[PDB]
Design a protein around this ligand. Structure first.
Ligand code: HEM
Length: 153
């Protein structure tokens, strides 16, 4: 539960991401992998990338980052009513990609780190608090979906 005002700050900063999704998606995956390298292992496509420069050159990394932020923007615009976009996500990440719920926490933080690095004037104390509650709400619903499918990592 976010107030309408909070959803509004969230969608306003999200507008910055939509003017460049692939660029923000790439920076988010490089941050996640620089901050939690163990997350790099779930991506078979990227197991062989050895440096930030190889990651920056990868066009597959850019497309996967693009896909991740385009699927996240779609869930945020639902403003809490994303049960339906959430289910297939929870089914594939739980059962096929095998993403433990703590990694959802690692990507939430890389997202906030890239918004803070890229848009400091627009990502003030309030947009920051609205944005972390929104990613937290999303994390929590996903874990709830993970525990009903019989998983939870
Ligand atoms: C921000 C939360 C996330 C969103 C919205 C998201 C969304 C997606 C989407 C839409 C896809 C493509 C279709 C599908 O397989 O379901 C995908 C693929 C994938 N996701 Fe995520 N995901 C998220 C978090 C994560 C995390 C934290 C990891 C690993 C640490 C991850 C690993 C993967 C992998 C390995 C794939 C397959 C990529 C490929 O084609 O190689 N996802 N994700």
């Amino acid at each position: 539960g976010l107030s309408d005002g909070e959803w509004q700050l969230v969608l306003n900063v999200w507008g910055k991401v939509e003017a460049d999704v692939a660029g923000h998606g790439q920076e988010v995956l490089i941050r996640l992998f620089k901050g939690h390298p163990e997350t790099l292992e779930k991506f078979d496509k990227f197991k062989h990338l050895k440096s930030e420069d190889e990651m920056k050159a990868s066009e597959d990394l850019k497309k996967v980052g693009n896909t991740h932020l385009t699927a996240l923007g779609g869930i945020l615009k639902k403003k809490g009513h994303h049960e339906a976009e959430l289910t297939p996500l929870a089914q594939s990440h739980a059962t096929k990609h095998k993403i433990p719920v703590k990694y959802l926490e690692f990507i939430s933080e890389a997202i906030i780190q890239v918004l803070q690095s890229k848009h400091p004037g627009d990502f003030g104390a309030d947009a920051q608090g609205a944005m972390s509650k929104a990613l937290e709400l999303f994390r929590n619903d996903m874990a709830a979906k993970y525990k009903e499918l019989g998983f939870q990592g």
